């Protein structure tokens, strides 16, 4: 069909790269399924919340992490104030997406961005970053979901190999 299946595994990366892959999954017409494995950094947790609500799964071994925007600043005294205010705009940006997608107020999330803190799989469903726990039972449904969407393209592949032979 038209479903997009992305896998999430990143322990670092810049904060701006996570927002680009967030809205790259928003403007897709069809649904999107995001599966978090290993960790979820500041660039990876935004990709995890960018999927369709109801198809987000986090395994027990995966650990979601919320991180402040790290940046490199160098310039004069007039230039050091304008880019540090952009850090306040990015901190307003990542707290806005975390508020509209997790059913949480903006004040309680902004009390979490001042210090780095790692989250577990049980705290991911409680905050609202995901929907279900990716246990061994619901992982079998992910195997059968990616089998029908790949055989829809492989049925055309089976007809091209028989026509060439």
């Amino acid at each position: 069909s038209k479903k997009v299946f992305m896998i999430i595994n990143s322990f670092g990366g810049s904060v701006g790269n996570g927002i680009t892959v967030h809205d790259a999954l928003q403007f897709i017409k069809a649904g999107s399924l995001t599966l978090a494995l290993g960790v979820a950094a500041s660039a990876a947790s935004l990709a995890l919340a960018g999927g369709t609500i109801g198809e987000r799964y986090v395994t027990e071994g995966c650990h979601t992490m919320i991180h402040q925007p790290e940046g490199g600043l160098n310039g004069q005294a007039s230039d050091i104030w304008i880019d540090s205010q952009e850090i306040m705009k990015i901190r307003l940006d990542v707290a806005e997406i975390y508020s509209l997608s997790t059913y949480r107020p903006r004040h309680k999330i902004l009390r979490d961005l001042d210090r780095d803190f790692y989250l577990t799989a049980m705290e991911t469903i409680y905050y609202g970053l995901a929907d279900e726990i990716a246990t061994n039972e619901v992982m079998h449904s992910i195997v059968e979901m990616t089998n029908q969407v790949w055989s829809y393209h492989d049925s055309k592949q089976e007809r091209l190999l028989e026509s060439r032979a």
Binding site: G16, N17, I19, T20, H22, D23, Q26, F27, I28, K29, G50, G51, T52, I53, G54, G72, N74, G75, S78, D79, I82, D83, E86, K89, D93, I97, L100, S101
Partner: protein, 217 residues
């Protein structure tokens, strides 16, 4: 001895899909710039618009330009390239009869930002959480005499005069207004107030929030 004629979308649909990801974007008339303006990456974008205007049948489909680069000024402030390289970009992009639909993903640092407003009016696409910056450009390390600094001052004099002429045609302002608003200090622009200023017009086509899709269900 036979001529190597190119094939296009009404003709190459029987030859299968392109194998590599830049070649899927070249068939879809979409140029994605994920690298700053190096002398290696500027040669392919000149050959790309030369290929799109080579044997196109209708020559009227809008060319999508997605830019994500630092231009010629990096994050630290020095010049990794010069401003004369952008003059080869706008002269080659504006040559074709096709309209130029311009989009931004994340960033446009003082060279890609003036190319963002230089597209077709009414179709400036943008992501709702991007950053736009318009600052006057700088020069690299030049060690000369007193008359050598004067000729380098004339190169940046033509840089602010050419960049404000693009912003005067896009935003509909005067020549001295764009120099005082944009090309004076290193400032930044968000997505919402840039629509009131005149940098962008709308968002990307087909954009819809995943929470707004849950409200429809």
């Amino acid at each position: 001895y036979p001529e190597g004629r190119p094939l296009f979308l009404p003709e190459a649909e029987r030859f299968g899909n392109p194998p590599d990801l830049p070649s899927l974007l070249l068939q879809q008339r979409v140029i994605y710039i994920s690298m700053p303006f190096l002398p290696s990456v500027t040669e392919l974008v000149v050959a790309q618009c030369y290929y799109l205007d080579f044997d196109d049948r209708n020559r009227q489909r809008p060319i999508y330009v997605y830019l994500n680069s630092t231009g010629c000024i990096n994050d630290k402030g020095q010049a990794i390239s010069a401003d004369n390289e952008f003059y080869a970009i706008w002269a080659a992009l504006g040559f074709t009869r096709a309209p130029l639909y311009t989009g931004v993903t994340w960033k446009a640092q003082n060279q890609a930002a003036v190319l963002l407003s230089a597209g077709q009016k009414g179709h400036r696409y943008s992501f709702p959480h991007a950053k736009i910056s318009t600052a006057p450009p700088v020069m690299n390390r030049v060690f000369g005499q007193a008359v050598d600094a004067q000729l380098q001052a004339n190169e940046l004099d033509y840089a602010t005069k050419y960049y404000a002429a693009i912003l005067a045609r896009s935003t509909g302002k005067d020549l001295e207004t764009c120099q005082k608003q944009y090309l004076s200090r290193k400032r930044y622009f968000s997505v919402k107030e840039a629509y009131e200023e005149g940098l962008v017009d709308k968002l990307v086509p087909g954009f819809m929030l995943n929470r707004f899709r849950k409200m429809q269900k």
